[PDB]
Amino acid sequence: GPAKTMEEASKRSYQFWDTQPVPKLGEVVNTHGPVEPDKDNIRQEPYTLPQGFTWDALDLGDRGVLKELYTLLNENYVEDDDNMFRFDYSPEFLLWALRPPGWLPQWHCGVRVVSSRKLVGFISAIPANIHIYDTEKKMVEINFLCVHKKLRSKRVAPVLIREITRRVHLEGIFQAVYTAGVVLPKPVGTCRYWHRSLNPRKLIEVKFSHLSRNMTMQRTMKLYRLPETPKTAGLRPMETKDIPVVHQLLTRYLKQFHLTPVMSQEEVEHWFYPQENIIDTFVVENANGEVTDFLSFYTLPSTIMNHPTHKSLKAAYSFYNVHTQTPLLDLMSDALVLAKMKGFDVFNALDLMENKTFLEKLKFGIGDGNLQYYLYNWKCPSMGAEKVGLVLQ
């Protein structure tokens, strides 16, 4: 089984991860570099799946195939620790997350049942330039590892991981970054989700939160009430003319952290240009016409499992927030107001980058879910959450 805490994880043997070029959970890392040298001959044949299952690369430009992936994740992807909420990535969100600049069709790696053609497994890779301490490396980001509930505990996830590794190796890339809600060998950083209630009545009704014993519903609703409009002068949605300055602002802002993406201007357009119900970015254009700050958050609802009335929890997730003239506290306050205006029930943020400076002050409450950060085939010292400067969807 999986381990959510470092306690549980110390008691595990990792039959798969012991075979992989990652550090052991027990060791402390005092060096910087690849775990193993680059391979100059790569396995040409796909790894063998169990009988009755076949590989199939997913063309997400086919609407029907995209909907099959939507359905696999909607029914079988990540749940909270109490099996009450499950991610509900939309088809259009999946296209955003899975076709950034440089995406490859072979890195959308599906498993189908041979007879029925049912999609029962998936894993993905997208290319990314990653800055880790003093090194910049072309890597991939791994995401959406999913095995159908009926196919579980049959060692299909290790096969998915080895096959995407092989397909990435064929393109000359030997490092990866990824996250997980569980502890694996070996986290480079550990983050914690925090939650800012926007519609506390619904959150309590669906048991996403609870009334804290000595507070009433009326007190809780007043506690989380927000202004109707944002307060920062010149706040407006990002437009095409802002792409260069958003790129510049982000590039300079990220230098202070130890694990960050290095985005081209085209990647900046992809990741930040607003798309309704996927990604929102607002810039601050001052009295001189200069863009000095920006905030962004992505749209990711959760299915509320087995509930008769409320079926979906509308969640906004803090993405990248860059401040040079507006205080970060004011920026995030305006993000909360905008998310409330757009109908979200909760605003989520990790404790990475400078987020701890605003979490308690803006009335976020700590969550029960960790987000561990990992590198594959890269040895380096771990870092505190405040030095993680990378957000994956």
């Binding site: 997980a180 939160s209 960790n370």
Partner: peptide
Amino acid sequence: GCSVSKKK
């Protein structure tokens, strides 16, 4: 993959 958190 990401992880699903709720309020402690």
